[PDB]
Structure formats: structure tokens, C-alpha cells
């Protein structure tokens, strides 16, 4: 099973999401990006895997449910099974990567990304090991009632670039974006 990884899109004052959906106004390429990142594996004859929350789960357009071309794993403690259209449910994320583990799953993952929500995010991200960052950063201020995580510097190293992911500044709809990634090992 391969890297573990966290992939955001986050406004300036650190909001992900506003009532279910994005604090911004649809960023079709932002979101190709996501789906680009997620989806490639380099791995001949495996997936990726997903991780999010619940809530992450039902604020996918429907079109989008499950996420095509990758195994959709749901984070719920309430749920007694993989909700519709979902493949897999864990009680945490501990047992989720387990379970990556386990024979089922053992040599189908490739990647696993965790895309949400906030406690998700932060419990992956103080998860000692090696693990990487894939931020957006949206320059501007949005008004939003979920957060990213606080990143540690001290710990998350900026990489100054990466394969298959543009360095410059981006813009759709008169909003302005940029992709960075972060590298942790502890
Ligand atoms: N990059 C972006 O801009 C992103 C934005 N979003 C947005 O934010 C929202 C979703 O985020 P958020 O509200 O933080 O919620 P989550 O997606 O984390 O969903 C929360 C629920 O999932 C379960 N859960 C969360 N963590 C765990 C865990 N470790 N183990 C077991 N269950 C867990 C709990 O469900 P239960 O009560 O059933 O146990 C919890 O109430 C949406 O608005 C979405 O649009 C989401 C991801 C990325
Ligand atoms: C897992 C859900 C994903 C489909 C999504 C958000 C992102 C999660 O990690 C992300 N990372 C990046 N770089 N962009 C994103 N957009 C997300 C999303 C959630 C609610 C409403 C609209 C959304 O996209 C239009």
C-alpha cells in the first residue's frame, strides 16, 4: 500500500467549506485538479483509496458519488454500513488504515488521500509518519463555518515544486489560487 496523503482547497482565513458546500463559487479547474490528483495512480492494476467524513460524503454532487476510478471509504462512528454508492466504512481513521492492510485491500490501494472534513484533516495530519499536503490556497477571504487545520512549519516542509502540479498563480472567476505541497516525516 502506498503514500498517505491530505488534499485541500482553503481561503485565506483557513475556511474548507461553508453549510455543506465550498466557500467559493465553483472552480472548474480547482476541481479537475482534485480529481486529477486523486485518481492518478502510477501502480499498474490498482486504485487509489479516498477517505473523508460523512458530512465530506453527502456535500459530493451526486454526480460525483462515489468518486469514479477510486475506492470511496466514509469515516463514521453513527453509520452501520457503507453508505449508497460508497464501497467502505470505518469507526475511525486508525481502522480505515488498517483495514488498508487486511487482504481485501492489500494490493488494491496504491495511494490513500484523505479529502475531509476539519477533524479528519487534523488527526491525519498529527498522525506521526510520512505524509504529505496537497493545499490550494484561494487568496482571498471567504465567509465559512469549516476550518483547515493549523499547519505546522516547523514539521511540514513547503516543496518548492512538484511533478504534475502547476507552481504558479491560477484564476477562475475573477479568484485567485495556487497549489502547494507539504511533506512531512516524523
Ligand atoms: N478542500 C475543501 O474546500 C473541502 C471542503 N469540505 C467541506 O467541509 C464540509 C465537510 O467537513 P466537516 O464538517 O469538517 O465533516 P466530516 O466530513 O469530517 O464529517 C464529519 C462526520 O464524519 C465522522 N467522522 C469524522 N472524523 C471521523 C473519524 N476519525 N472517525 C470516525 N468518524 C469520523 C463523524 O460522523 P458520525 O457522527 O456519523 O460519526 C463526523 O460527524 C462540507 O461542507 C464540504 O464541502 C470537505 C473536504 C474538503
Ligand atoms: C471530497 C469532496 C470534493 C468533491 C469537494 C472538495 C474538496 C475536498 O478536497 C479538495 N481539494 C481540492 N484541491 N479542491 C477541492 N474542491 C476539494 C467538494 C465538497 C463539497 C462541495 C464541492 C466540492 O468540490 C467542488
Known sequence: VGSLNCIVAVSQNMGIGKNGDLPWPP???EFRYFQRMTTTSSVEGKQNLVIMGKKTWFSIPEKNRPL???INLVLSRELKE???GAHFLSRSLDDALKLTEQPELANKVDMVWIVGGSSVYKEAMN???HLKLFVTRIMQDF??????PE???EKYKLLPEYPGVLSDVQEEKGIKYKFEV???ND
Not at 465567509?143 to 483547515?148: A, I, V, W
Open 151 to 153: 499547519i505546522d512549519l
Open 82 to 84: 457503507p453508505p449508497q
Open 182 to 184: 507539504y511533506e512531512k
Open 127 to 129: 498522525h506521526p509518519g
Open 143 to 148: 465567509e465559512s463555518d469549516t476550518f483547515f
Open 68 to 70: 469514479k476510478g477510486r
Open 27 to 29: 472552480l472548474r479547474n
